[PDB]
């Protein structure tokens, strides 16, 4: 948790939940496992542009 | 209501309410109401004479 945060406060990383993270550990092996949301760079960007009528009064 | 107000000042009309005076603006056209009392020329003049007694002392 400490490493992944360190990567989220650098911006190396978007974000990751700490509850998923697991530690299973059994005999020599350490079984661990993880989730994180990799940081991606903007290549497209949408806008949906919609006119609408507006009153006006006094 | 500028325009309104020199036509009270050169006697062009009567009266308007500026209250009553409403714009609304919608799209390419701007619906305008207004009221507006109307100047008008004497032609009858009724006179209602009543005769009544009076009391003198001292």
């Known amino acids: 948790q400490s490493?992944?945060?360190r990567k989220k406060?650098?911006?190396?990383?978007?974000?990751?939940p700490a509850e998923?993270?697991?530690v299973i550990v059994e005999g020599?092996?350490?079984r661990i496992s993880m989730t994180v949301y990799p940081?991606?760079?903007f290549k497209?960007?949408?806008?949906?542009l919609v006119y609408k009528q507006q009153t006006l009064q006094a």
Do not use: H, M, P, T
């Not at 406060?9 to 990751?16: L, V, Y």
């Open 28 to 30: 020599n092996e350490a």
């Open 3 to 5: 490493y992944l945060g």
């Open 44 to 48: 497209k960007i949408s806008v949906s």
């Open 20 to 22: 998923d993270v697991q």
């Open 9 to 16: 406060r650098d911006n190396e990383i978007q974000d990751f």
């Open 39 to 41: 940081i991606r760079s």
